[PDB]
Enzyme design. Structure first.
Site, PDB file in Angstrom:
ATOM      1  N   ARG A 189      43.907  53.845  36.368  1.00 18.03           N
ATOM      2  CA  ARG A 189      44.656  52.608  36.152  1.00 18.03           C
ATOM      3  C   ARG A 189      43.713  51.525  35.598  1.00 18.03           C
ATOM      4  O   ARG A 189      43.378  50.571  36.291  1.00 18.03           O
ATOM      5  CB  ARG A 189      45.274  52.140  37.478  1.00 18.03           C
ATOM      6  CG  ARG A 189      46.482  51.239  37.339  1.00 18.03           C
ATOM      7  CD  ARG A 189      46.262  49.916  38.039  1.00 18.03           C
ATOM      8  NE  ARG A 189      45.074  49.257  37.521  1.00 18.03           N
ATOM      9  CZ  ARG A 189      44.766  47.992  37.749  1.00 18.03           C
ATOM     10  NH1 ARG A 189      45.567  47.237  38.487  1.00 18.03           N
ATOM     11  NH2 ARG A 189      43.651  47.492  37.244  1.00 18.03           N
ATOM     12  N   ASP A 197      39.592  45.748  44.638  1.00 16.17           N
ATOM     13  CA  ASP A 197      39.696  44.529  43.838  1.00 16.17           C
ATOM     14  C   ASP A 197      41.126  44.248  43.360  1.00 16.17           C
ATOM     15  O   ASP A 197      41.597  43.105  43.362  1.00 16.17           O
ATOM     16  CB  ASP A 197      38.750  44.644  42.635  1.00 16.17           C
ATOM     17  CG  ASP A 197      38.421  43.299  42.008  1.00 16.17           C
ATOM     18  OD1 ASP A 197      38.417  42.278  42.730  1.00 16.17           O
ATOM     19  OD2 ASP A 197      38.137  43.265  40.788  1.00 16.17           O
ATOM     20  N   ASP A 198      41.818  45.306  42.969  1.00 21.03           N
ATOM     21  CA  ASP A 198      43.170  45.191  42.450  1.00 21.03           C
ATOM     22  C   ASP A 198      44.229  44.838  43.465  1.00 21.03           C
ATOM     23  O   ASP A 198      45.250  44.254  43.119  1.00 21.03           O
ATOM     24  CB  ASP A 198      43.517  46.484  41.744  1.00 21.03           C
ATOM     25  CG  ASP A 198      42.461  46.859  40.749  1.00 21.03           C
ATOM     26  OD1 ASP A 198      42.288  46.069  39.799  1.00 21.03           O
ATOM     27  OD2 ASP A 198      41.791  47.904  40.927  1.00 21.03           O
ATOM     28  N   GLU A 211      37.831  50.061  42.069  1.00 25.73           N
ATOM     29  CA  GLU A 211      38.379  49.355  40.926  1.00 25.73           C
ATOM     30  C   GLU A 211      39.165  50.261  40.003  1.00 25.73           C
ATOM     31  O   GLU A 211      38.689  51.318  39.623  1.00 25.73           O
ATOM     32  CB  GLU A 211      37.237  48.722  40.128  1.00 25.73           C
ATOM     33  CG  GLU A 211      37.679  47.797  39.012  1.00 25.73           C
ATOM     34  CD  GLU A 211      37.984  46.407  39.520  1.00 25.73           C
ATOM     35  OE1 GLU A 211      39.134  45.959  39.388  1.00 25.73           O
ATOM     36  OE2 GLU A 211      37.069  45.756  40.062  1.00 25.73           O
ATOM     37  N   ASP A 212      40.368  49.833  39.644  1.00 24.26           N
ATOM     38  CA  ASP A 212      41.232  50.568  38.725  1.00 24.26           C
ATOM     39  C   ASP A 212      41.611  52.000  39.069  1.00 24.26           C
ATOM     40  O   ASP A 212      41.614  52.886  38.212  1.00 24.26           O
ATOM     41  CB  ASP A 212      40.648  50.492  37.311  1.00 24.26           C
ATOM     42  CG  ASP A 212      40.788  49.105  36.718  1.00 24.26           C
ATOM     43  OD1 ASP A 212      41.009  48.188  37.527  1.00 24.26           O
ATOM     44  OD2 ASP A 212      40.684  48.924  35.479  1.00 24.26           O
ATOM     45  N   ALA A 238      55.920  46.081  42.160  1.00 29.15           N
ATOM     46  CA  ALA A 238      55.830  46.265  43.602  1.00 29.15           C
ATOM     47  C   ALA A 238      54.699  47.229  43.917  1.00 29.15           C
ATOM     48  O   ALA A 238      54.821  48.072  44.805  1.00 29.15           O
ATOM     49  CB  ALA A 238      57.163  46.815  44.150  1.00 29.15           C
ATOM     50  N   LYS A 267      32.470  44.485  35.533  1.00 33.94           N
ATOM     51  CA  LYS A 267      32.591  43.829  36.835  1.00 33.94           C
ATOM     52  C   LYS A 267      31.207  43.495  37.387  1.00 33.94           C
ATOM     53  O   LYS A 267      30.974  42.389  37.882  1.00 33.94           O
ATOM     54  CB  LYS A 267      33.310  44.734  37.851  1.00 33.94           C
ATOM     55  CG  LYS A 267      34.785  45.017  37.565  1.00 33.94           C
ATOM     56  CD  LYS A 267      35.670  43.782  37.716  1.00 33.94           C
ATOM     57  CE  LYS A 267      37.132  44.136  37.435  1.00 33.94           C
ATOM     58  NZ  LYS A 267      38.078  43.016  37.702  1.00 33.94           N
ATOM     59  N   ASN A 316      46.845  42.366  32.786  1.00 30.35           N
ATOM     60  CA  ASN A 316      45.823  42.390  31.751  1.00 30.35           C
ATOM     61  C   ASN A 316      45.870  43.750  31.045  1.00 30.35           C
ATOM     62  O   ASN A 316      46.370  44.723  31.615  1.00 30.35           O
ATOM     63  CB  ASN A 316      44.450  42.183  32.380  1.00 30.35           C
ATOM     64  CG  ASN A 316      44.382  40.923  33.222  1.00 30.35           C
ATOM     65  OD1 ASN A 316      44.620  39.817  32.724  1.00 30.35           O
ATOM     66  ND2 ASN A 316      44.050  41.078  34.506  1.00 30.35           N
ATOM     67  N   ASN A 337      42.572  35.359  37.550  1.00 30.49           N
ATOM     68  CA  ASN A 337      41.971  36.685  37.449  1.00 30.49           C
ATOM     69  C   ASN A 337      40.989  36.846  38.603  1.00 30.49           C
ATOM     70  O   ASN A 337      40.322  35.883  38.975  1.00 30.49           O
ATOM     71  CB  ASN A 337      41.260  36.800  36.095  1.00 30.49           C
ATOM     72  CG  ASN A 337      40.696  38.183  35.843  1.00 30.49           C
ATOM     73  OD1 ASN A 337      39.729  38.593  36.481  1.00 30.49           O
ATOM     74  ND2 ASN A 337      41.302  38.910  34.903  1.00 30.49           N
ATOM     75  N   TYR A 359      34.514  40.597  29.155  1.00 28.57           N
ATOM     76  CA  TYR A 359      35.536  40.836  30.163  1.00 28.57           C
ATOM     77  C   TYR A 359      36.878  40.882  29.440  1.00 28.57           C
ATOM     78  O   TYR A 359      36.906  41.109  28.229  1.00 28.57           O
ATOM     79  CB  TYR A 359      35.478  39.700  31.193  1.00 28.57           C
ATOM     80  CG  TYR A 359      36.193  39.957  32.502  1.00 28.57           C
ATOM     81  CD1 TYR A 359      36.010  41.151  33.203  1.00 28.57           C
ATOM     82  CD2 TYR A 359      37.030  38.991  33.054  1.00 28.57           C
ATOM     83  CE1 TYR A 359      36.652  41.373  34.427  1.00 28.57           C
ATOM     84  CE2 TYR A 359      37.672  39.197  34.270  1.00 28.57           C
ATOM     85  CZ  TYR A 359      37.482  40.382  34.953  1.00 28.57           C
ATOM     86  OH  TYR A 359      38.100  40.558  36.168  1.00 28.57           O
ATOM     87  N   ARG A 409      18.299  46.262  26.437  1.00 24.76           N
ATOM     88  CA  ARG A 409      17.035  45.957  25.761  1.00 24.76           C
ATOM     89  C   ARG A 409      16.191  44.965  26.539  1.00 24.76           C
ATOM     90  O   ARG A 409      15.010  45.204  26.775  1.00 24.76           O
ATOM     91  CB  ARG A 409      17.272  45.411  24.345  1.00 24.76           C
ATOM     92  CG  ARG A 409      17.597  46.492  23.311  1.00 24.76           C
ATOM     93  CD  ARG A 409      17.544  45.951  21.876  1.00 24.76           C
ATOM     94  NE  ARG A 409      18.555  44.934  21.614  1.00 24.76           N
ATOM     95  CZ  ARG A 409      19.795  45.185  21.213  1.00 24.76           C
ATOM     96  NH1 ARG A 409      20.198  46.435  21.013  1.00 24.76           N
ATOM     97  NH2 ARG A 409      20.641  44.176  21.027  1.00 24.76           N
ATOM     98  N   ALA A 448      48.959  45.053  43.099  1.00 26.72           N
ATOM     99  CA  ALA A 448      48.880  43.597  43.106  1.00 26.72           C
ATOM    100  C   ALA A 448      50.018  42.902  43.862  1.00 26.72           C
ATOM    101  O   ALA A 448      49.776  42.007  44.681  1.00 26.72           O
ATOM    102  CB  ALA A 448      48.804  43.076  41.672  1.00 26.72           C
TER     103      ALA A 448
END
Ligand SMILES: Nc1ncnc2c1ncn2[C@@H]1O[C@H](COP(=O)(O)OP(=O)(O)OP(=O)(O)O)[C@@H](O)[C@H]1O
Ligand SMILES: Nc1ncnc2c1ncn2[C@@H]1O[C@H](COP(=O)(O)OP(=O)(O)OP(=O)(O)O)[C@@H](O)[C@H]1O
Ligand SMILES: Nc1ncnc2c1ncn2[C@@H]1O[C@H](COP(=O)(O)OP(=O)(O)OP(=O)(O)O)[C@@H](O)[C@H]1O
Ligand SMILES: O=C(O)/C=C/C(=O)O
Ligand SMILES: O=C(O)/C=C/C(=O)O
Ligand SMILES: O=C([O-])C(=O)[O-]
Ligand SMILES: O=C([O-])C(=O)[O-]
Ligand SMILES: O=C([O-])C(=O)[O-]
Ligand SMILES: [Mn+2]
Ligand SMILES: [Mn+2]
Ligand SMILES: [Mn+2]
Lengths: 554, 554, 554
Positions: B146, B259-260, B236-237, B293, B164, B402, B447, B93, B72, B296
């Site tokens: 993921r 990022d991960d 990401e993910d 493993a 993000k 997370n 994080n 987030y 908006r 991350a």
């Protein structure tokens, strides 16, 4: 056909379909990728809405959510309303709309409507020229001085015209793009708003000088100059003084009416007419006492007289059956409180004794019908109700003031205190009432929403130039004529709200036939089948194809 | 200077100011009448927002309200976030963004981002060309396989790149119009979503054929073809398998990072670097055990090694101090479960005895640091935590998975069970913990939000072409270097979240200085004062004047 | 108001002012820098135009230049036309427009008007929906089969509707944005065009099947569906058969007329009415012979009869004074050549001898008035002219066929061969003629341009639904009543062409008063002063301010 393509199609709620945009529309209109891969039907979208609404608790929270859709996807917004108009009416209309207005500045997100302030005097046309739509046919305007029975809410009153116009479409199928909510801002006398940092209007008391009348004049001229001389202009929630004078001043010059005076008059009469059918009471035995003597009282009384006259009674004798009790007491010849020309015909010689309270008035006058239109709260006290029940076998009690908190009395109070003998109606909704003997009574809603939608549609479709009182008398008859015997036995004085769409269209049909028969319609050629014509002209909530016309050449 | 006038300026959230449009802007841009007479300041608008938010109850309800503002009034949206980033972070987030993704299709209102599906293969460029912004500098893309520790959420995962990017702007002052959220939809294996009528993606299982890799290739090509080869692309993910192979495949060809794997790697190291300063522990004595493993664990382990290497240890020696325990158990040479090339360096000869549970692993290996990054729930059981407290005086315990429900353990559990001797950090937020002895512990949030905003800003401003691991090593040092001795004593392993804006800018500054020193920046002319340059380039939430330049001619 | 800003305002000829944009408009509308620093007045611009025109040599070159301005700066285009309509008329209208048409495909630069082809059958509404203007009030449409006296020019005929509408504005002040030129393309039978690589229409012979009538029907319906049932539709240059058929078929259903049948009829009658005054000749001694028996002849004859009837003669008596000679000869009862219902009333019993040539017809019938309307060249040979001069003291000779080369004879021929005793008028322009005795004769131009502009304006302003023949009779009287006795003596049968603007307005005023007096006007409220009303509604070539309304608030 639409001129814009790409992102703009999604940003404009009039065209935006969300995931309902077809694959072909997306690819051709440059939307591929701007929407999730999923293609949805309006049904799925409607389901998503109902799923979310069910998880909400406060009426206001629901009002913000549903009204928010009018600014995201217009088609979906009206589909949603159409799915269950009865259960949503209380949220988008009275009483919740009243709560919305009182806190309009706090819940603001996007502006809705056209705003004309006294500071814009001499420049109204440039403001009217800023409205995006060029085919406006109907306008609902308010200056926020008399919002429901809430008083002066100033610019926060904009919620009213916006609400009324949503109902134009939802109830009568009037095109949304042809409607224009307008708020005239000349200041406000509400001290609390003048100190509210979120107030949406000019921080000044109401301008009551000649500049006020001039601004309204510039407004009327500007609207008609751009959209046409027959553009329908519905005055809504103006203060008593201004309401009448503007109606008297413009009704023969423009296509206009005041909802509060004329719209409320039609619905009230409609209810009284329905009540007469269940009670079969002698027009001569009718004694009507009004709690209030303003816009609604005078409007209703006048329509009642017109009805009694067409029924073999003289204007004079009809008027004598009507009494009014305003904030100063009974309107009697020679009283201290002022009596204007409109009230004069209902101001009679003082009775034996002069009542102090409305209760006294009921016991002294022994009215057969009591109509509450003072917008001042629970004035039909338990004692007033009992009085009516001891005096009449089937007392008629109308508590028409809105919103709910301002109502003269509740449905529960009326039915229980009269032992289920009263014929009740109210302006704001009340659920069914069950007495100790197990009998269930369903209160009807005598709210002008049953009238302005259908009257607006007819007036618009017939390109009517002016609206006479008789038009509202006809709408009243058209409304009550839709009641079924079964429904009358239920204690219903009005068709079920769930059927307000079909009811409004039938009213529109009956009124357009009336307009044509009385040389008040100017459309050509004249359709031969009025009913078919009106039904065909109604706007639909179903999505339209936005695909360009593509085809091979021989 | 804007190329649009009238209603469109209000419909576009990027330009819409609501009642903040000045009188002159409204008159000159044709908005007069479309807005309430009231002229407001951003302060008043921010006040209205906080007033309404305060009355809300559920985090998701708040998420819908705040994210709605992004569609908006964009300026206001970021003003609101900047007013109190710390209290809103949990809403826009983690953990709320995870909840929002789980029911993304149910709370859907307006689409956000660019959607590219496998069904669009061969036509990705046309989709990219539909994005309205011409100067995209950064992209955050996910395929939703993921999503946090929630698994395969498909197109519902779009909520992640959107969040993000909101943080790109909120935390590092990166221009919103230069950011592009992207969701690659190749289907989803989540059976529940495949039967969900509100799903927003293709109704098919994930396409794991060559077509998948080709679509991702077309994506990379299309974005860079339109926006430039140096366009930052943040994966990401993505699922484990794909995450690594795409990073290896594109890191030297495009300006990209994961990022991960890398972002999370830098935050973790940063916390370990902070911990080392509070307990002054010689890394020859540090024994690290990873619960997991994958993306991350391997990312963190690699950065840790690089840190130990630049601090006097050989790569071999450093890797020997690191152990990993995945869903099949301890990664030891010759185990049944698979071990790829990335895990090999951390797969050591089996210990005396082989552990069955992570608890057994802790007791047998006697690690001094435990890092939870399995995204599988409370695997750091009370017994695991007790074991770390009996084996170490000051155990380091990181529960980074997370959202909150996936975390290995809570702050409460860690501090209480170790009697306040542990150095704890988590991916998701936890309130301060007060022990029976009165000591209050404030857990830090390890994080990646502490890293990607600052790194993204530096890479963008420096027109960097490729991102080496060293850049994240530097970012990690830049983050921890901002901790003050007083904050260390508080149990703080990271700068206060409330200061994330300045922290991100300082990281950006340190990273750009690093990029220039290592010939990885390509900006002309080269600013002499890097710090000043960075700060001057940041986007601000203050409204800009939209007034045309009007002046007199001599 | 203007919804566009920037370059678009310059690209749209409707708004573009060139260097006439004021400094304020440029700065506020984003044009500063896109125009030379010079600020010019329309006067200077007009001078630039006249300066350039004066240096040009061929009429066609001038046509291309002036018509090009309509696509660059509309206001200037009409200003230019208004400066000297008399000297430009021959360029933008007959005869040059005839030449333009014959080579339309060769001089093409930008398209003008709306094109609807037979290949678009069933999709006409979508084509009508593509026209940019929403308030069309008048349409001039042709199918190019009978362009002037040039025959079938197919789509090249679009030049006609374009020219005619330019005159709607230039002569009657009708708004240009309310005019729509239309070309219906169903193919062409002109062999040369079918082999022309620059042809602008479908390469097929005319479709004369039911599909043709259907297409025209779809056209009428689509135009009125979008713009209104009273939209004025002027049929222009349709072949004989279709011309009458469509006039009869649509005149009572739509607001339509055929310029070639009715427009030409009125201007011709007006000429005769003027001649009546100069020679005071008794209607009983009026013997009229038409060269031709088609669109114009039948139209003129019918209007002449109505005039004689209104003056004391019976329909039969009046028709008895009118004879017609078409390509097969004299229309007489029992001749071999066909005679339809329209011609029957003027088909009399064969005279003593049957004429072979028009010359024979003149000698046998001894007519006092000769009207050439065969679109076939110099059929009024020197001998025909001498015969008229020998038979009559003051012969009336009208050579109305256009363009010039198609005229029955020139003014020079007429005046010299009759020794200045004839009353002459032509469709195409001829300069003054000086005889050897020194007398100068100024030929009048009996072209429908003196009629359709004024009639169109009246029909539009009155929202007239249908046009009766009497409306053209009135227009004819209105035209001739404009002549002053002074002018009559100068050989004037029509007001000066230089005064066409005021002549058209006056005709518009007289027709509107006629429409109101005969209940054919539907505007409200009805203006008290019609003359004042019409003059106030005319579009002006003066530039309008494009400045947004900026002002201070109190
Ligand atoms: N306490 C009261 N007791 C009796 N009458 C009252 C009382 N308070 C107000 N009234 C009367 O109610 C009338 C209100 O008239 P007004 O024109 O302001 O509104 P209205 O059109 O009746 O409003 P509504 O929309 O509620 O029907 C006045 O005549 C006023 O005197
Ligand atoms: N129940 C479990 N016990 C121990 N390890 C587990 C367990 N469940 C999953 N894991 C491990 O956690 C790792 C997850 O790796 P993956 O690449 O999927 O995500 P990640 O990025 O490492 O984790 P996160 O989603 O928390 O950031 C895998 O190595 C897996 O074997
Ligand atoms: N050579 C000729 N001699 C005499 N009459 C002719 C000759 N050639 C054509 N004609 C007649 O002229 C008439 C033309 O009628 P049509 O309807 O085609 O056009 P029009 O509108 O009357 O002509 P214009 O617009 O050129 O004045 C026909 O009746 C035709 O027979
Ligand atoms: O269902 C949709 O697509 C839209 C929902 C909304 O605008 O709230
Ligand atoms: O405060 C405003 O004007 C806007 C609020 C919103 O978009 O929610
Ligand atoms: O004002 C009111 O109460 C209404 O219109 O219903
Ligand atoms: O995936 C995550 O958990 C993250 O990015 O924070
Ligand atoms: O057709 C013609 O000659 C005309 O209209 O002038
Ligand atoms: Mn009202
Ligand atoms: Mn992530
Ligand atoms: Mn013609």
């Amino acid at each position: 056909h639409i001129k814009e393509k790409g992102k703009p199609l999604m940003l404009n709620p009039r065209t935006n379909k969300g995931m309902a945009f077809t694959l072909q529309e997306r690819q051709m209109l440059g939307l591929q990728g701007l929407l999730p891969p999923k293609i949805e039907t309006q049904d799925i979208q409607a389901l998503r809405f109902h799923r979310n609404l069910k998880k909400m608790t406060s009426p206001l929270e629901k009002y913000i959510y549903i009204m928010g859709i009018q600014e995201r996807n217009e088609k979906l917004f009206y589909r949603i309303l159409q799915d269950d108009i009865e259960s949503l009416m209380p949220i988008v209309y009275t009483p919740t709309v009243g709560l919305a207005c009182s806190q309009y500045g706090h819940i603001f997100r996007r502006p809705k409507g056209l705003f004309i302030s006294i500071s814009d005097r001499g420049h109204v046309r440039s403001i009217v020229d800023n409205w995006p739509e060029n085919h406006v046919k109907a306008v609902v305007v308010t200056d926020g001085e008399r919002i429901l029975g809430l008083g002066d809410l100033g610019v926060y009153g904009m919620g009213i015209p916006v609400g009324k116009l949503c109902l134009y479409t939802a109830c009568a199928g009037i095109r949304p793009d042809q409607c224009l909510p307008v708020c005239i801002d000349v200041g406000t006398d509400n001290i609390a708003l003048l100190k509210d940092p979120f107030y949406m209007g000019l921080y000044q008391k109401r301008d009551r000088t000649q500049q006020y009348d001039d601004l309204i004049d510039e407004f009327m001229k500007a609207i008609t100059d751009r959209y046409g001389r027959n553009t329908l202009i519905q005055f809504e929630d103006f203060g008593n003084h201004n309401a009448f004078r503007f109606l008297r001043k413009y009704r023969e010059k423009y296509c206009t009416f005041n909802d509060d005076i004329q719209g409320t008059a039609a619905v009230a009469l409609a209810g009284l007419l329905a009540a007469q059918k269940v009670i079969s009471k002698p027009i001569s035995e009718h004694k009507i006492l009004f709690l209030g003597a303003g816009e609604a009282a005078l409007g209703i009384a006048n329509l009642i007289v017109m009805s009694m006259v067409e029924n073999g009674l003289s204007e004079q004798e009809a008027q004598k059956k009507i009494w009014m009790f305003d904030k100063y007491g009974l309107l009697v010849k020679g009283r201290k409180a002022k009596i204007d020309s409109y009230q004069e015909p209902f101001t009679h010689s003082a009775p034996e004794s002069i009542p102090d309270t409305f209760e006294d008035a009921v016991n002294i006058l022994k009215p057969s019908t009591i109509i509450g239109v003072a917008g001042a709260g629970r004035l039909f006290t338990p004692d007033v109700i009992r009085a009516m029940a001891s005096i009449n076998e089937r007392p008629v009690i109308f508590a028409l003031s809105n919103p709910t908190a301002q109502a003269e009395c509740t449905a529960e109070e009326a039915y229980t205190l009269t032992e289920g003998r009263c014929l009740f109606a109210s302006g704001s909704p009340f659920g069914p009432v069950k007495l100790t003997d197990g009998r269930v009574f369903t209160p009807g809603q005598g709210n002008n929403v049953y009238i302005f939608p259908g009257v607006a549609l007819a007036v618009i479709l017939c390109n009517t130039r002016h609206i006479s009182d008789s038009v509202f008398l006809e709408a009243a008859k058209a409304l009550t004529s839709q009641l079924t015997d079964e429904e009358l036995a239920q204690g219903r004085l009005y068709p079920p709200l769930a059927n307000i769409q079909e009811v409004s269209i039938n009213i529109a049909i009956k009124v357009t036939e009336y307009l044509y028969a009385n040389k008040m319609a100017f459309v050509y050629p004249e359709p031969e089948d009025k009913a078919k014509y009106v039904k065909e002209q109604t706007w639909r909530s179903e999505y339209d194809s936005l695909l360009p016309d593509v085809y091979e050449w021989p």
